[PDB]
Design an enzyme around this catalytic site. Structure first.
Site, PDB file in Angstrom:
ATOM      1  N   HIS A 240      -6.359   0.138  27.361  1.00 41.27           N
ATOM      2  CA  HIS A 240      -7.107   1.217  26.728  1.00 41.27           C
ATOM      3  C   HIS A 240      -7.445   2.353  27.683  1.00 41.27           C
ATOM      4  CE1 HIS A 240      -8.391  -1.692  23.327  1.00 41.27           C
ATOM      5  NE2 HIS A 240      -7.484  -0.850  22.863  1.00 41.27           N
TER       6      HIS A 240
ATOM      7  N   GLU B 299      -6.817  -3.819   5.224  1.00 34.71           N
ATOM      8  CA  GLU B 299      -7.052  -2.379   5.282  1.00 34.71           C
ATOM      9  C   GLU B 299      -6.196  -1.698   4.230  1.00 34.71           C
ATOM     10  OE1 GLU B 299      -9.489  -1.985   6.965  1.00 34.71           O
ATOM     11  OE2 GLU B 299      -9.266  -3.654   8.386  1.00 34.71           O
TER      12      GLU B 299
ATOM     13  N   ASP C 212      12.680  -7.766  19.860  1.00 34.63           N
ATOM     14  CA  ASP C 212      11.638  -7.729  20.877  1.00 34.63           C
ATOM     15  C   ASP C 212      10.287  -7.597  20.196  1.00 34.63           C
ATOM     16  OD1 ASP C 212      13.413  -7.789  23.172  1.00 34.63           O
ATOM     17  OD2 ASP C 212      13.864  -5.691  22.739  1.00 34.63           O
TER      18      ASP C 212
ATOM     19  N   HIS D 176      -0.558   3.464  18.399  1.00 29.92           N
ATOM     20  CA  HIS D 176      -1.503   2.806  19.309  1.00 29.92           C
ATOM     21  C   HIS D 176      -1.039   1.390  19.655  1.00 29.92           C
ATOM     22  CE1 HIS D 176      -5.587   1.870  20.937  1.00 29.92           C
ATOM     23  NE2 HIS D 176      -5.341   0.675  20.429  1.00 29.92           N
ATOM     24  N   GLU D 177      -0.719   0.613  18.620  1.00 30.67           N
ATOM     25  CA  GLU D 177      -0.311  -0.777  18.826  1.00 30.67           C
ATOM     26  C   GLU D 177       0.986  -0.883  19.618  1.00 30.67           C
ATOM     27  OE1 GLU D 177      -2.282  -3.141  18.467  1.00 30.67           O
ATOM     28  OE2 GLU D 177      -3.798  -2.037  17.298  1.00 30.67           O
TER      29      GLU D 177
ATOM     30  N   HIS E 176      -3.334  -5.631  15.866  1.00 31.04           N
ATOM     31  CA  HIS E 176      -3.252  -6.007  17.273  1.00 31.04           C
ATOM     32  C   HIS E 176      -1.797  -6.201  17.695  1.00 31.04           C
ATOM     33  CE1 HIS E 176      -4.006 -10.468  15.867  1.00 31.04           C
ATOM     34  NE2 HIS E 176      -2.720 -10.174  15.784  1.00 31.04           N
TER      35      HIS E 176
ATOM     36  N   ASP F  18     -10.098  -9.841   9.939  1.00 25.01           N
ATOM     37  CA  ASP F  18     -11.508  -9.959   9.538  1.00 25.01           C
ATOM     38  C   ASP F  18     -11.865  -9.284   8.222  1.00 25.01           C
ATOM     39  OD1 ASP F  18     -11.035  -7.405  10.438  1.00 25.01           O
ATOM     40  OD2 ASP F  18     -12.758  -7.321  11.798  1.00 25.01           O
TER      41      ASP F  18
ATOM     42  N   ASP G  12       4.941  -8.511  19.985  1.00 23.78           N
ATOM     43  CA  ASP G  12       4.843  -8.376  18.524  1.00 23.78           C
ATOM     44  C   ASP G  12       3.611  -7.584  18.085  1.00 23.78           C
ATOM     45  OD1 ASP G  12       7.071  -9.971  18.717  1.00 23.78           O
ATOM     46  OD2 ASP G  12       6.279 -11.608  17.466  1.00 23.78           O
TER      47      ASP G  12
ATOM     48  N   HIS H   3       0.243  -0.810  23.151  1.00 23.22           N
ATOM     49  CA  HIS H   3      -0.092  -2.129  23.716  1.00 23.22           C
ATOM     50  C   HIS H   3       1.157  -2.983  23.933  1.00 23.22           C
ATOM     51  CE1 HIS H   3      -4.388  -1.675  23.627  1.00 23.22           C
ATOM     52  NE2 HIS H   3      -4.461  -1.605  22.310  1.00 23.22           N
TER      53      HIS H   3
ATOM     54  N   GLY I 146       9.130 -14.229  22.750  1.00 20.03           N
ATOM     55  CA  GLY I 146       8.428 -14.829  21.624  1.00 20.03           C
ATOM     56  C   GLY I 146       7.387 -13.923  21.006  1.00 20.03           C
TER      57      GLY I 146
ATOM     58  N   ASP J  50       0.797  -1.228   0.000  1.00 18.97           N
ATOM     59  CA  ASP J  50       0.000   0.000   0.000  1.00 18.97           C
ATOM     60  C   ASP J  50       0.835   1.287   0.000  1.00 18.97           C
ATOM     61  OD1 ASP J  50      -2.273  -1.588   0.114  1.00 18.97           O
ATOM     62  OD2 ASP J  50      -2.675  -1.156   2.244  1.00 18.97           O
TER      63      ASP J  50
ATOM     64  N   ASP K  22      -3.492  -5.543   9.848  1.00 19.01           N
ATOM     65  CA  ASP K  22      -4.402  -6.186   8.907  1.00 19.01           C
ATOM     66  C   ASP K  22      -4.237  -5.583   7.516  1.00 19.01           C
ATOM     67  OD1 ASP K  22      -6.475  -7.399   7.534  1.00 19.01           O
ATOM     68  OD2 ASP K  22      -8.009  -6.899   9.020  1.00 19.01           O
TER      69      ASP K  22
HETATM   70  C1  LIG Z   1     -13.461  -4.075  25.168  1.00 19.94           C
HETATM   71  C2  LIG Z   1     -12.652  -2.831  25.240  1.00 19.94           C
HETATM   72  O1  LIG Z   1     -11.489  -2.814  25.616  1.00 19.94           O
HETATM   73  N1  LIG Z   1     -13.331  -1.767  24.813  1.00 19.94           N
HETATM   74  C3  LIG Z   1     -13.771  -1.611  23.415  1.00 19.94           C
HETATM   75  C4  LIG Z   1     -15.100  -0.853  23.316  1.00 19.94           C
HETATM   76  O2  LIG Z   1     -14.953   0.227  22.427  1.00 19.94           O
HETATM   77  C5  LIG Z   1     -15.306   1.485  23.009  1.00 19.94           C
HETATM   78  C6  LIG Z   1     -15.140   1.819  24.461  1.00 19.94           C
HETATM   79  O3  LIG Z   1     -15.710   2.270  22.227  1.00 19.94           O
HETATM   80  C7  LIG Z   1     -16.264  -1.604  22.714  1.00 19.94           C
HETATM   81  O4  LIG Z   1     -17.096  -1.933  23.807  1.00 19.94           O
HETATM   82  C8  LIG Z   1     -18.420  -1.401  23.507  1.00 19.94           C
HETATM   83  C9  LIG Z   1     -19.456  -2.302  22.900  1.00 19.94           C
HETATM   84  O5  LIG Z   1     -18.625  -0.224  23.755  1.00 19.94           O
HETATM   85  C10 LIG Z   1     -15.910  -2.790  21.830  1.00 19.94           C
HETATM   86  C11 LIG Z   1     -16.791  -2.733  20.570  1.00 19.94           C
HETATM   87  O6  LIG Z   1     -16.575  -3.869  19.740  1.00 19.94           O
HETATM   88  C12 LIG Z   1     -15.904  -3.773  18.443  1.00 19.94           C
HETATM   89  C13 LIG Z   1     -15.091  -4.915  17.884  1.00 19.94           C
HETATM   90  O7  LIG Z   1     -16.030  -2.746  17.822  1.00 19.94           O
HETATM   91  O8  LIG Z   1     -14.531  -2.761  21.463  1.00 19.94           O
HETATM   92  C14 LIG Z   1     -13.674  -2.898  22.584  1.00 19.94           C
HETATM   93  N2  LIG Z   1     -12.286  -2.990  22.206  1.00 19.94           N
HETATM   94  C15 LIG Z   1     -11.593  -3.972  21.661  1.00 19.94           C
HETATM   95  S1  LIG Z   1     -10.548  -4.701  22.535  1.00 19.94           S
HETATM   96  N3  LIG Z   1     -11.741  -4.218  20.369  1.00 19.94           N
HETATM   97  C16 LIG Z   1     -10.643  -4.406  19.439  1.00 19.94           C
HETATM   98  C17 LIG Z   1      -9.699  -3.224  19.312  1.00 19.94           C
HETATM   99  N4  LIG Z   1      -8.710  -3.340  18.264  1.00 19.94           N
HETATM  100  C18 LIG Z   1      -7.383  -3.815  18.650  1.00 19.94           C
HETATM  101  C19 LIG Z   1      -6.609  -2.802  19.431  1.00 19.94           C
HETATM  102  O9  LIG Z   1      -7.207  -2.181  20.327  1.00 19.94           O
HETATM  103  O10 LIG Z   1      -5.420  -2.663  19.171  1.00 19.94           O
HETATM  104  C20 LIG Z   1      -7.461  -5.144  19.413  1.00 19.94           C
HETATM  105  C21 LIG Z   1      -7.838  -6.326  18.558  1.00 19.94           C
HETATM  106  C22 LIG Z   1      -6.182  -5.530  20.096  1.00 19.94           C
HETATM  107  S2  LIG Z   1      -9.014  -2.775  16.944  1.00 19.94           S
HETATM  108  O11 LIG Z   1      -8.338  -3.469  16.032  1.00 19.94           O
HETATM  109  O12 LIG Z   1     -10.310  -2.783  16.705  1.00 19.94           O
HETATM  110  C23 LIG Z   1      -8.415  -1.284  17.030  1.00 19.94           C
HETATM  111  C24 LIG Z   1      -7.117  -0.996  16.660  1.00 19.94           C
HETATM  112  C25 LIG Z   1      -6.586   0.283  16.754  1.00 19.94           C
HETATM  113  C26 LIG Z   1      -7.339   1.340  17.196  1.00 19.94           C
HETATM  114  C27 LIG Z   1      -6.779   2.724  17.290  1.00 19.94           C
HETATM  115  C28 LIG Z   1      -7.217   3.622  18.230  1.00 19.94           C
HETATM  116  C29 LIG Z   1      -6.696   4.896  18.288  1.00 19.94           C
HETATM  117  C30 LIG Z   1      -5.732   5.313  17.410  1.00 19.94           C
HETATM  118  C31 LIG Z   1      -5.314   4.436  16.457  1.00 19.94           C
HETATM  119  C32 LIG Z   1      -5.832   3.168  16.419  1.00 19.94           C
HETATM  120  C33 LIG Z   1      -8.630   1.068  17.548  1.00 19.94           C
HETATM  121  C34 LIG Z   1      -9.153  -0.205  17.480  1.00 19.94           C
HETATM  122 CA   LIG Z   2      -3.626  -3.339   2.471  1.00 19.15          CA
HETATM  123 CA   LIG Z   3      -9.951  -5.618   9.359  1.00 17.59          CA
HETATM  124 CA   LIG Z   4       8.349 -10.549  20.593  1.00 14.17          CA
HETATM  125 ZN   LIG Z   5      -1.508 -11.511  14.780  1.00 11.61          ZN
HETATM  126 ZN   LIG Z   6      -6.078  -0.976  21.272  1.00 14.72          ZN
END
Ligand SMILES: CC(=O)N[C@@H]1[C@@H](OC(C)=O)[C@H](OC(C)=O)[C@@H](COC(C)=O)O[C@H]1NC(=S)N/C=C/N([C@@H](C(=O)O)C(C)C)S(=O)(=O)c1ccc(-c2ccccc2)cc1
Ligand SMILES: [Ca+2]
Ligand SMILES: [Ca+2]
Ligand SMILES: [Ca+2]
Ligand SMILES: [Zn+2]
Ligand SMILES: [Zn+2]
Length: 157
Positions: free
Chosen positions: A124, A96, A53, A114-115, A78, A70, A89, A118, A85, A19, A93
């Site tokens: 969060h 995107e 790391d 953001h990542e 994520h 997805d 990391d 984590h 290990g 991309d 996706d």
């Molecule tokens: C559970 C939890 O920790 N809270 C949220 C809730 O979302 C809320 C409060 O609105 C929400 O709960 C509700 C219903 O209000 C829930 C909604 O469900 C979905 C799937 O939309 O989402 C929860 N959050 C998680 S953990 N969802 C997944 C997350 N992403 C990843 C992440 O946070 O890195 C994660 C897999 C590790 S993400 O891919 O969607 C994501 C990856 C990256 C930014 C990101 C952000 C900022 C800047 C750049 C980037 C975002 C989001």
């Molecule tokens: Ca792409």
């Molecule tokens: Ca996706």
């Molecule tokens: Ca590692």
């Molecule tokens: Zn993975």
């Molecule tokens: Zn996050």
């Protein structure tokens, strides 16, 4: 783990999305790391080794760790908490469209920042303007909020 047990963090860009040009991708990651290094006792050094790391990957769907992506939108990326290990990391996706975020797609800089949050052990935030907020919102303003910095000092001083 709750945090990295050494201060000199290494990272490996294992593969690339088509991309963006590789140099732009390298720079996006470098900038995202620079954000966290300014406010921590940590440094981030790029390496060409599987021993890094933080291993960085672009992948789609099930990509080898049992937490499948997805397709377009939904999950963007994520990252695993600190440790050995797979831990530490960061995976993006590639269903995107990765961009500079001003136009179509998602900012690779912002999502990586953001990542990496984590990957240093942050969870969060409940502050919409904070980088560690769980919903992506594109901005051209400074990404870090007091809460982000409080959280990272809470772990690293
Ligand atoms: C559970 C939890 O920790 N809270 C949220 C809730 O979302 C809320 C409060 O609105 C929400 O709960 C509700 C219903 O209000 C829930 C909604 O469900 C979905 C799937 O939309 O989402 C929860 N959050 C998680 S953990 N969802 C997944 C997350 N992403 C990843 C992440 O946070 O890195 C994660 C897999 C590790 S993400 O891919 O969607 C994501 C990856 C990256 C930014 C990101 C952000 C900022 C800047 C750049 C980037 C975002 C989001
Ligand atoms: Ca792409
Ligand atoms: Ca996706
Ligand atoms: Ca590692
Ligand atoms: Zn993975
Ligand atoms: Zn996050």
């Amino acid at each position: 783990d709750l945090k990295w047990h050494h201060h000199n963090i290494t990272y490996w860009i294992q593969n690339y999305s088509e991309d963006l040009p590789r140099a732009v991708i390298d720079d996006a990651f470098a900038r995202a790391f620079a954000l966290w290094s300014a406010v921590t006792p940590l440094t981030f050094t790029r390496v060409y080794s599987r021993d890094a790391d933080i291993v960085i990957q672009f992948g789609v769907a099930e990509h080898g760790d049992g937490y499948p992506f997805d397709g377009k939108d939904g999950l963007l990326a994520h990252a695993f908490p600190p440790g050995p290990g797979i831990q530490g990391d960061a995976h993006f996706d590639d269903d995107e469209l990765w961009s500079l975020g001003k136009g179509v797609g998602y900012s690779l800089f912002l999502v990586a920042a953001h990542e990496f949050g984590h990957a240093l052990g942050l969870d969060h935030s409940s502050v919409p303007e904070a980088l560690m907020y769980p919903m992506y919102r594109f901005t051209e303003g400074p990404p870090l909020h007091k809460d982000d910095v409080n959280g990272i000092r809470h772990l690293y001083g």
